[PDB]
């Protein structure tokens, strides 16, 4: 499975969660930013690695990173 | 859900497919292999006989074509054996053909039937 | 329990349950339990075939009949085309009946008789004797073919020629001399190689 | 002498070209698709 | 809020069928089932190709992968303002609720969610690969 | 379920697609990425792999010797090595028809054979081989050596024979033994063979294992060596009328430095080569006592590296910590080794064509062309690998904390300046070389050849004059009869060297003009651009502005997605990937120049090259179109000849190259969608759905696609040029 990591530079804009096409990320309460929210990846077994979340992240540098790992039926997005 | 058409839903084609040895579901796999091998070797002997490199020389075109068809049948039998060994390794009614022993017997029956079909196609031209 | 050299060790899957065990499996092809039975049956039938073939070849050279590698070219009172058709037709049913015997019992058999023994001397010691004689006959058949390859003539003739000059007539003084000499030296060094690492 | 016979290519070329690659491909194919216990 | 249970006897939208449906994976590995409630009969676009008609009330559909179910969920939420939910069904009959996992959509923060895969540092603070070398397998410095 | 293959990667074994087999095959030698790999186990696996590689090399050499001794004509080629073509091996193909059988039946053989272009006949003839028995014995000996090396590789993996990690890091001991034993003692032994066998065999005296202990290499028998009268070994050398292989005109000297070439064989003197190996053997043996191992005396490389920092701080910390970053990094050592080996391979190609060492090698035009092209392509591939491993070192083994302030860190500190200057040099060279070419092409097209720009290479001609060539008329150093450098060598080696360099019939410092100047600038452009791509990929391997954390993704990864404007081909692997094309283009230019200049030289018309190499139309018509006429006529509707195999190989290479363009242009997505449609078709087809796949069919990955496309491109490139070069050179001569 791919490795999805969230960093402390996240501003809690929830743009990465809305851009995820397989429901891998979510928002959890936090205290390190004004939005009081932080991105999380509790369902990385369903991540395909499209990196749409990185495209939707506005922080410099990115707060969410996807490292392509082992490949399975779910990570390869195979319907067969 | 799926797409249904008269080509895949006609009762005539369904009966024709069910009458084939591969879709018998209840006979011995070795018998199925023998039948399929005979039906395949008989048609396989043709192209090598009429189009091989020795197709113009007389009294040996059929010999070379039949030997080439026999070699092809042997290669196909080896392919069937390795397919069965690499496909069934663990774990209506279940067809016994889709099993290690069933597919091995099927491959052996295919080899015997194919060689018999090639030999029968050779003598049929004499 | 003697091994295949003075000081070998079984490869953890040749404990000795099978007859004629000597712990010989360097390629480890019998690691699978299911393959060990099939390989054993194959060894037994190969040994039986080699036994009958070696006895037949040795009997043909004594009487004076054609050589074993040229008996096929001789013209018999039949046609070779019909001979091959009858041979594969009979053996199809015979091998099919023999295979079904191994699936139900696990050993060889003839036709519908799985433990084929009309006389009845099927003992545990007799089974091991069959294996030993089959292995010896397999090596003997390989020797027959190899002697006919470089020397021709015949097995009995080869033994007769070896008695004329044993120090000068051997595999080392033949056309395959250096290859077999190097192979013999490598083989003699092999047990020390296995014992040095272990 | 080490000189091979005249019939050596007629036996070794078909061997190395069809018998050995078929055996190697079959054994390798069985090894690749073997399932771990 | 409680986890819903799949109702296999749920009417499906009016569709004539297509060649982009389920395959052998649904019968041997797993498949996905999406259910939603529609206020009226409406024509929508199937993620596998074609136009189907969702009926008034419950609607159930089957897909080969989770991405198809989420794509249909996004289409139903953004266009018809509905609230769909899907499950992962195994050949043995096991049903696993997938989204929304906690009953609330992940774009909005909800109490009770425990953060996972969160690094309390930035990217520039990651160590060099030499410090991660000779590990159990190929490991990136972000995994530690 | 989990598959057994690959055993070294658990993640790949759980992959249910066809990508598992491909990745298991491509990651088999990446031991650092294997599961549960340690440093000691890594070094042990590399040791075993090294032994296996040596076994393969020795077996290949024994195979070549055996085939030449069995199906060759070495016994007949030694009698007339000017008019007899060497035979590689016999041809046994059932697909051959009758005309192909009599077409390939040549060279005096009784059947279809292949004419060798490797030059092993000349090499074996020069070193002393005369009969087929000698080649047979050498083949058996090399086969035994190969078996011994294979056994050593297997033995060093078993317990009580695995070397520890500390043994693999003894750099001082390894360097001392490689310089004194692997280099010096081997060269001394080669000198012993040349003095004992090659030199007497070239004088008509047979010296084999049966009589080398009773045959003296010199009539004075080791007395001048022990008494210091070494000049006695240079007395009475081979005269100008000596016939190779016979005693007519032969001498008695064994160590000379006459220089030049043999008047008959047009190759270097055997006594000169023996003396050369003796001198380098002494030098290498002496150099093998520089490092401290176990006797107090010697050096420690760490001390020399740490005591080499400039006082003004121009190099920062200097080389502090460089000993640890090299000894603990295998990629650094591999990169250094590949860089040196690639440069040495190029040196071998240049020196081998210019100064032929083997007898009757210069007359064999096909052998010379094939050897030069082969070594230059090998050198280019090795150079690309050296830079690729440098990038791998930066990503996997570079530690900024340990290399703080030294030269290694300072390189990355100003990497932008290096990349920018490489870009400027490449841009200048490309713009000007292309501009001069297009200008000359327009002048030749408009019918005004006197208007083209022809810059004379005065610097290289000045160097040629410094070496002794008096054609240009500079008259200085070796070109002037009154210089100190000229008068100091007139009694040792300058006569032969001057006679050989002033001869326009050999390849020793060929005459150059404006065409040589232009093509040399094209070569400079190729070298600078390939270096720019490789250096930029190695320096940006750890990161850049677009990807600040590139080092966290490894050396080879597909991309970083379409975000931030797009990140296609951002990894260092992709930089090496793009650099392979430039390497092939550069080697193509150097081999094209070499082949055209030598073709015009051998044909006796150097003016053709001098007047047609200044414009690209001359290169396309007078070199590519003109020399491919016999090649494409190997098989035509009227029949075929022995050159049809090269025509088939020519079309074969074109097909492979074009097939590579498919993986190079079309990308994954389209193929994945197509494969999905094929999966549906197989699943919905009766009588065929009963047979199912074990691995799910998927399209090749992005990285795999690049590798496959590059492999096809390179294979087609190599095969096409090899077929054209061999066919044109062999058919013309």
Curated annotation (Swiss-Prot), chain A:
Domain 4Fe-4S ferredoxin-type: start-end pairs: 1-30, 38-67
Catalytic activities: reduced [plastocyanin] + hnu + oxidized [2Fe-2S]-[ferredoxin] = oxidized [plastocyanin] + reduced [2Fe-2S]-[ferredoxin]
Recorded consequence of changing residue 48 to I: Leads to partial destabilization of PSI. Unable to grow photoautotrophically
Keywords: 4Fe-4S, Chloroplast, Electron transport, Iron, Iron-sulfur, Membrane, Metal-binding, Oxidoreductase, Photosynthesis, Photosystem I, Plastid, Repeat, Thylakoid, Transport
The keyword ATP-binding is annotated on this UniProt entry: no
Pfam families assigned to the protein according to its UniProt record, in alphabetical order: Fer4_7
Consequence when changing residue 11 to V: 60-fold increase in affinity of PSI for ferredoxin. Unable to grow photoautotrophically
Details of cofactor binding: Binds 2 [4Fe-4S] clusters. Cluster 2 is most probably the spectroscopically characterized electron acceptor FA and cluster 1 is most probably FB.
GO molecular function (one): metal ion binding
GO biological process, one term: photosynthetic electron transport in photosystem I
Stored Gene3D superfamilies: 3.30.70.20
Annotated PROSITE patterns: 4FE4S_FER_1, 4FE4S_FER_2
Subunit comment: The eukaryotic PSI reaction center is composed of at least 11 subunits.
Described function: Apoprotein for the two 4Fe-4S centers FA and FB of photosystem I (PSI); essential for photochemical activity. FB is the terminal electron acceptor of PSI, donating electrons to ferredoxin. The C-terminus interacts with PsaA/B/D and helps assemble the protein into the PSI complex. Required for binding of PsaD and PsaE to PSI. PSI is a plastocyanin/cytochrome c6-ferredoxin oxidoreductase, converting photonic excitation into a charge separation, which transfers an electron from the donor P700 chlorophyll pair to the spectroscopically characterized acceptors A0, A1, FX, FA and FB in turn.
Protein name: Photosystem I iron-sulfur center
Native source organism of the sequence: Chlamydomonas reinhardtii
Gene from which the chain derives: psaC
Curated annotation (Swiss-Prot), chain E:
Subcellular location: Plastid, Chloroplast thylakoid membrane
Keywords (A to Z) from UniProt: Chloroplast, Membrane, Photosynthesis, Photosystem I, Plastid, Thylakoid, Transit peptide
Disulfide cross-links: none
Organism: Chlamydomonas reinhardtii
Function: PsaD can form complexes with ferredoxin and ferredoxin-oxidoreductase in photosystem I (PS I) reaction center. PSAD may encode the ferredoxin-docking protein.
Transit peptide is among the record's keywords: yes
Signal sequence segment: none
Name of the molecule in the record: Photosystem I reaction center subunit II, chloroplastic
Lipid bilayer topology: Peripheral membrane protein
Residues of the full protein shown: 53 to 196 of 196
Main localisation: plastid
GO BP annotation list: photosynthesis
GO cellular component, one term: photosystem I reaction center
Transport listed as a keyword: no
Family membership noted in the UniProt record: Belongs to the PsaD family.
Domain of life of the source: Eukaryota
From Swiss-Prot, chain F:
Recorded topology in the membrane: Multi-pass membrane protein
Phenotypic consequence of residue 654 to R: No PSI detected
GO biological process: photosynthesis
Membrane spanning stretches: 46-69, 135-158, 175-199, 273-291, 330-353, 369-395, 417-439, 517-535, 575-596, 643-665, 707-727
Keyword Oxidoreductase applies: yes
Keywords from the named record: 4Fe-4S, Chlorophyll, Chloroplast, Chromophore, Electron transport, Iron, Iron-sulfur, Magnesium, Membrane, Metal-binding, Oxidoreductase, Photosynthesis, Photosystem I, Plastid, Thylakoid, Transmembrane, Transmembrane helix, Transport
Name recorded for this polypeptide: Photosystem I P700 chlorophyll a apoprotein A2
Gene: psaB
């Amino acid at each position: 499975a791919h490795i999805v990591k969230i960093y402390d530079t996240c501003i809690g804009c929830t743009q990465c969660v809305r851009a995820c096409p397989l429901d891998v990320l979510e928002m959890v309460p936090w205290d390190g930013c004004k939005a009081s929210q932080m991105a999380s990846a509790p369902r990385t077994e369903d991540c395909v690695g499209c990196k749409r979340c990185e495209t939707a992240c506005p922080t410099d540098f990115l707060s969410v990173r996807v490292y392509l790992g082992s490949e399975s039926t779910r990570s390869m997005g195979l319907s067969y | 859900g799926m797409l249904e058409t008269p080509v895949t839903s006609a009762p005539i084609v369904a009966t024709y497919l069910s009458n084939l040895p591969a879709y018998r579901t209840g006979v011995a796999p070795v018998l199925r292999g023998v039948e399929i091998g005979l039906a395949h070797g008989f048609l396989l002997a043709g192209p090598f006989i009429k189009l091989g490199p020795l197709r113009n020389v007389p009294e040996t075109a059929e010999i070379a074509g039949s030997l080439s068809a026999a070699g092809l049948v042997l290669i196909l039998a080896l392919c069937l054996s390795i397919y069965g060994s690499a496909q069934f390794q663990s774990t209506v009614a279940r067809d016994p053909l889709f099993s290690a022993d069933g597919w091995s017997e099927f491959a052996a029956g295919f080899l015997v039937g194919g060689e018999a079909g090639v030999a029968w196609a050779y003598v049929c031209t004499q | 329990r003697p091994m295949w050299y003075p000081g070998a060790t079984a490869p953890a899957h040749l404990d000795g349950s099978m007859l004629g065990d000597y712990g010989f499996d360097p390629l480890r092809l019998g690691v699978n339990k299911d393959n060990l039975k099939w390989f054993r049956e194959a060894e037994l039938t190969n040994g039986r075939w080699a036994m009958a073939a070696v006895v037949g070849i040795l009997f043909t050279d004594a009487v004076g009949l054609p050589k074993f590698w040229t008996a096929g070219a001789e013209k018999y009172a039949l046609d070779n085309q019909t001979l091959a058709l009858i041979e594969v037709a009979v053996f199809a049913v015979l091998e099919g009946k023999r295979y079904e015997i191994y699936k139900k019992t696990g050993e060889t058999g003839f036709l519908s008789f799985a433990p084929f023994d009309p006389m009845g001397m099927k003992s545990e010691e007799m089974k091991l004797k069959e294996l030993k004689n089959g292995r010896l006959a397999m090596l003997a058949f390989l020797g027959f073919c190899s002697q006919a390859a470089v020397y021709g003539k015949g097995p009995i003739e080869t033994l007769q020629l070896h008695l004329a000059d044993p120090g000068h007539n051997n595999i080392y003084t033949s056309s395959v001399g250096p290859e077999t000499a190097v192979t013999v030296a490598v083989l003699c060094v092999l047990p020390m190689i296995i014992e040095a690492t272990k | 002498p080490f000189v091979p016979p005249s019939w050596a290519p007629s036996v070794f070329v078909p061997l190395t070209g069809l018998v050995l690659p078929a055996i190697a491909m079959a054994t390798l194919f069985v090894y690749i698709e073997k399932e771990a216990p | 809020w409680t986890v819903p249970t799949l109702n296999p006897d749920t009417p499906s939208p009016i569709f004539g069928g297509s060649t982009g449906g389920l395959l052998r994976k649904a019968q041997t590995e797993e498949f996905y089932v999406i259910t939603w409630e529609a206020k009226k009969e409406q024509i929508f676009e199937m993620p596998t190709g074609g136009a189907a008609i969702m009926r008034q009330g419950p609607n159930l559909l089957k897909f080969g992968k989770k991405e198809q179910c989420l794509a249909l969920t996004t289409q139903l939420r953004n266009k018809f303002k509905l609230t769909p939910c899907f499950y992962r069904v195994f050949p043995d009959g096991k049903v696993q609720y997938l989204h929304p996992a906690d009953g609330v959509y992940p774009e909005k923060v909800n109490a009770g969610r425990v953060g996972a895969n969160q690094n309390m540092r930035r990217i520039g603070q990651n160590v060099n690969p030499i410090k991660v070398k000779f590990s159990g397998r190929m490991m990136s410095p972000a995994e530690i | 379920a989990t598959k057994l293959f690959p055993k070294f990667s658990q993640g790949l074994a759980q992959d249910p697609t066809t990508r598992r087999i491909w990745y298991g095959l491509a990651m088999a030698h990446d031991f650092e990425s294997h599961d549960g790999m340690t440093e000691e186990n890594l070094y042990q696996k590399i040791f075993a792999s090294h032994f296996g590689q040596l076994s393969i090399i020795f077996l290949w050499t024994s195979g070549n010797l055996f085939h030449v001794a069995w199906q060759g004509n070495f016994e007949q080629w030694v009698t007339d090595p000017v008019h007899i073509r060497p035979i590689a091996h016999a041809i046994w193909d059932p697909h051959f028809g009758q005309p192909a059988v009599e077409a390939f039946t040549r060279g005096g053989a009784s059947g279809p054979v292949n004419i060798s272009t490797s030059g092993v006949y000349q090499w074996w003839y020069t070193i002393g081989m005369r009969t087929n028995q000698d080649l047979y014995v050498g083949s058996v000996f090399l086969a035994l050596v190969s078996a011994i090396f294979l056994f050593a590789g297997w033995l060093h993996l078993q317990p009580n024979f695995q070397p520890s990690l500390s043994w693999f890091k003894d750099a001082e001991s390894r360097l001392n033994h490689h310089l004194s034993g692997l280099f010096g003692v081997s060269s001394l032994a080669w000198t012993g063979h040349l003095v004992h066998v090659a030199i007497p065999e070239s004088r008509g005296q047979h010296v084999g294992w049966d009589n080398f202990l009773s045959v003296l290499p010199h009539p004075q028998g080791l007395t001048p060596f022990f008494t210091g009268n070494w000049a006695a070994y240079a007395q009475s050398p081979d005269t100008a009328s000596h016939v190779f292989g016979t005693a007519q005109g032969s001498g008695q000297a064994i160590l000379t430095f006459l220089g030049g070439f043999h008047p008959q064989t047009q190759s270097l003197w055997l006594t000169d080569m023996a003396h050369h190996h003796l001198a380098i053997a002494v030098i290498f043996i002496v150099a093998g006592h520089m490092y401290r191992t176990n006797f107090g005396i010697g050096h420690r490389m760490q001390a020399i590296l740490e005591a080499h920092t400039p006082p003004s701080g121009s190099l920062g910390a200097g080389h502090k910590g460089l000993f640890d970053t090299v000894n603990n990094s295998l990629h650094f050592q591999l990169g250094l080794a590949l860089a040196s080996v690639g440069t040495i391979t190029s040196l071998v190609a240049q020196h081998m064509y210019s100064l032929p060492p083997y007898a009757f090698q210069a007359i064999d035009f096909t052998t010379q062309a094939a050897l030069y092209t082969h070594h230059q392509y090998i050198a280019g591939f090795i150079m690309c690998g050296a830079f690729a491993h440098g990038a791998i070192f930066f990503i996997r083994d570079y530690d900024p904390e340990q290399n703080k302030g030294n030269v290694l860190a300072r390189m990355l500190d100003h990497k932008e300046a290096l990349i920018s200057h490489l870009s400027w040099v490449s841009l200048f060279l490309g713009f000007h070389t292309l501009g001069l070419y297009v200008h000359n092409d327009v002048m030749q097209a408009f019918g005004t050849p006197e208007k083209q720009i022809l810059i004379e290479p005065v610097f290289a001609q000045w160097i040629q004059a410094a070496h002794g060539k008096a054609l240009y008329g500079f008259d200085f150093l070796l070109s002037s009869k009154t210089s100190a450098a000229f008068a100091n060598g007139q009694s040792l080696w300058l006569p032969g060297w001057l006679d050989a360099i002033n001869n326009n019939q050999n390849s020793l410092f060929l005459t150059i003009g404006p065409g040589d100047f232009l093509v040399h600038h094209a070569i400079a452009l190729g070298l600078h651009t390939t270096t720019l791509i490789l250096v930029k990929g190695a320096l940006d391997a750890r990161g850049s502005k677009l990807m600040p954390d590139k080092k966290d993704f490894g050396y080879s990864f597909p991309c970083d997605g379409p975000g931030r404007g797009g990140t296609c081909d951002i990894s260092a692997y992709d930089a090496f990937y793009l650099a392979v094309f430039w390497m092939l283009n550069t080697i193509g230019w150097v081999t094209f120049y070499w082949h055209w200049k030598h073709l015009t030289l051998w044909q006796g018309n150097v003016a053709q090259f001098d007047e047609s190499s200044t414009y690209l139309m001359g290169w396309l018509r007078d070199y590519l179109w003109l020399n491919s006429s016999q090649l494409i006529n190997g098989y035509n509707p009227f029949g075929m000849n022995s050159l049809s195999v090269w025509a088939w190989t020519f079309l074969f290479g074109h097909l492979i190259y074009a097939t590579g363009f498919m993986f190079l242009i079309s990308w994954r997505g389209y193929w994945q969608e197509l494969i999905e449609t094929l999966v549906w078709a197989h699943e919905k087809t009766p009588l065929a759905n009963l047979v199912y796949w074990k691995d799910k069919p998927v399209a090749l990955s992005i990285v795999q696609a690049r590798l496959v496309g590059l492999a096809h491109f390179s294979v087609g490139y190599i095969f096409t040029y090899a077929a054209f070069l061999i066919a044109s050179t062999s058919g013309r001569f």
